[PDB]
Amino acid sequence: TQLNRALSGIAAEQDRNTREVFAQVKQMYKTPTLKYFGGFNFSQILPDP
Amino acid sequence: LKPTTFMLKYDENGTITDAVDCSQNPLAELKCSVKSFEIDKGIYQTSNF
Ligand SMILES: *[C@@H]1O[C@H](CO)[C@@H](O[C@@H]2O[C@H](CO)[C@@H](O)[C@H](O)[C@H]2NC(C)=O)[C@H](O)[C@H]1NC(C)=O
Ligand SMILES: *[C@@H]1O[C@H](CO)[C@@H](O[C@@H]2O[C@H](CO)[C@@H](O)[C@H](O)[C@H]2NC(C)=O)[C@H](O)[C@H]1NC(C)=O
Numbered sequence: 001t002q003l004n005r006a007l008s009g010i011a012a013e014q015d016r017n018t019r020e021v022f023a024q025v026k027q028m029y030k031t032p033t034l035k036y037f038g039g040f041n042f043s044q045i046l047p048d049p
Numbered sequence: 050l051k052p053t054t055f056m057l058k059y060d061e062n063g064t065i066t067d068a069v070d071c072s073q074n075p076l077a078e079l080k081c082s083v084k085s086f087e088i089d090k091g092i093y094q095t096s097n098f
Contacts, residue, residue, distance in 0.1 A: 008094055 056081050 031049055035042045054071035071081035079095055080086060 004094060 054081065058086070
């Protein structure tokens, strides 16, 4: 009983470590079709839809 | 009489006031683990199958 509380206690922080990094974002924005914002090319950084 | 597992709550005077069957349903299989009668919302860990 004490072992599974230890590994699931480790496993629960691996969710907390990922949410404290990526999930700082309140809202989902769309992918812009514009990709030269003044000649700054951005197809490699944006997802290719 | 059958050999199952019960959890018992004793008062200030050693009187059994309430009891829980640990083999009735999964909700009461949970209360025997955490040692409480009123259990908060979430996933808790129980015995494996
Ligand atoms: C951003 O740079 C990329 C480099 O891959 C350009 O993509 C290529 O553009 C040429 C000519 O336009 C095409 O022949 C290729 O097929 C493109 N490759 C891919 C993978 O799409 C892209 O045109 C540039 N975009 C802007 C806005 O400057
Ligand atoms: C445990 O037993 C004691 C008796 O020794 C109870 O205390 C008495 O309770 C009655 C009724 O509530 C009161 O009128 C008395 O004044 C109490 N006496 C003392 C010395 O406290 C107590 O209530 C019992 N507790 C439980 C949880 O059953």
